[PDB]
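[job 0412] stage=fold_complex status=start
inputs:
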Amino acid sequence: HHWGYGKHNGPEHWHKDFPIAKGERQSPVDIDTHTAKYDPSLKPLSVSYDQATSLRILNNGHAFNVEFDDSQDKAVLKGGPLDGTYRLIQFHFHWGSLDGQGSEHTVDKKKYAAELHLVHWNTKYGDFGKAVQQPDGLAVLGIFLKVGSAKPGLQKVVDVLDSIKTKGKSADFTNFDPRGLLPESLDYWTYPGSLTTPPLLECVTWIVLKEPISVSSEQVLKFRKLNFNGEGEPEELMVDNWRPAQPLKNRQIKASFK
Ligand SMILES: NS(=O)(=O)c1ccc(NC(=O)N2CC(=O)N3CCc4ccccc4[C@@H]3C2)cc1
Ligand SMILES: [Zn+2]
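[job 0412] stage=fold_complex status=done
writing structure:
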């Protein structure tokens, strides 16, 4: 009886196995744009993905992950609110059953159709597993998706999804350039939070871009053909794999922009 996104094992149940679910710095949150304050001290944000080396794409039963070779300093996030260098390890998405829902963060209570999470770990902790035990261990770059024009740089991901339909399937996925998933502007909001899935560790500096990317209805419809189940098990479509907004508690959301 494992955690998931069903009626019986969804986000409102997670606190029984993961009591930190009711903690002081849980994610995602609603971003109240009028209450976020411009912080002129944030340093410029630096996304350096030219040398990123993708390895594989995996259906883990909760989302699909594009994983990167993080054995050297190639693809790094620095600057913004961050002290030091954070290395890209994987990206994944959260999405809805309908275009009106799917994002984890919300903006003035608006839900986007999906949200991209580019996950990075702080190199001062040596490995990912050590980093997630630290309050500044991870930096996750979050990018909203809206439905409209296709995102050409997403299509290579869309086209491999038929080969990883069910939980536990993986496929080779080399030479994918995650710069093709970024919007034009790097304006962002930032706050201290958590993983949005169990174990819900409070180790993340969240950096949420203000500008959504546009993807086509056909691209997101292909996300919604994935399965939560394993092969040979009753089919359950992988949709609504998002945690709703959590209490902000004693936190301030900072804006990089006026
Ligand atoms: N929704 S979110 O952005 O808040 C979020 C939620 C969970 C994770 N975890 C992650 O990307 N994992 C978990 C992990 O232990 N390893 C173990 C080490 C290892 C090694 C290679 C590739 C991936 C991994 C994964 C990475 C991160 C972010
Ligand atoms: Zn995520």
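[job 0412] summary: The pocket of zinc ion (ligand 2) is lined by residues 92, 94, 117, 196 (CB under 6 Å).
[job 0412] exit 0
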